[PDB]
Amino acid sequence: KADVEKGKQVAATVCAACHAADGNSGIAMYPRLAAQHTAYIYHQTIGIRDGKRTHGSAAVMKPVVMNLSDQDILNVSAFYAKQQPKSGEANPKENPELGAKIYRGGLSDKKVPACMSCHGPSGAGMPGGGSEIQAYPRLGGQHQAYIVEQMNAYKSGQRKNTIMEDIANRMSEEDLKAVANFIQGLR
Template structure:
């Protein structure tokens, strides 16, 4: 594992979780022409659309995400998350390299209201499941740019990430998120590597204070762990995660600090 130390990072002020996704896909309908009397030949567009979208009609099966299609659908995300998923504003998370399945899960949670955010509710609501997969595939195809860690916080942050803290009942972060922070797609654990410390810290504090993003087993994992961390622990592990990235030439293998 490789780390890039930096000077002191200012404390996080506030927490804004705003993933901004926009639907820019088009759905084309075709139907056979039907004989009609001249008086009813010009049917209003709204009525035609309603007739085409009859309840109970079979919908197309969801396919694996298409990154090319997702590029257009995620175009508006660049304002907050960067065009390639590497946000320049630390209050917005990096999405580059994040797993398609995890992005779909979060969008679904925003759409259903399980994960609450006024902006994302509006953005996720019009998205179809296929749109979500395409957007997820687009960001998953991008590379997350390495971040930096505060050298003063690395020792404690490394302990928590790699070993946990048995005295507090805190497991090692890498047990779920992998030694290099790439996560575990099969188990639905997200990528953390190089994520902004400010975003990680704000999210952990939110979980510490009781926020949850659902009622399933996965939704209960992090709030329970975060409650056992104090403010200094949260700052340390968040900084460590920002500096966490695969060393150049490591070829996927973890390199030691």
């Protein structure tokens, strides 16, 4: 029922300036959206438009999406969810070996579970549907700076999610910077 063609024009005329027309943003401030899951894109946009998601730089996006209809946001969500994801590159000096170990096997000493167990072996996440009561957003190729910022919001409680708040608070700045670096290069 969602109209991907209309979603295309919305992304082209509204979102592209920050997130790119395919969702593969080139500015580390604007998170990637290509192949992010439909319900996740939809609810995050609505939250930013409606003043519920306030942390970080959400304030620059809210005015631009203020007069988008709910159907408009659903259409551009379905559009972005079908795009092909591009990845950044892992910085060899940002301990990508530790990042990979956090991602694939967690940090058992600090009860940090492997990110991959929810976010997938390529960081594709999991969409909602079926009898699944819990979906997981895509992370692969996401800008490392954005990842660290969200992880900090979860740490401080500026962003709410009991699962991620508990995970982020068990980790160190070094842990976050490493796993973020690895995630940027996940293709």
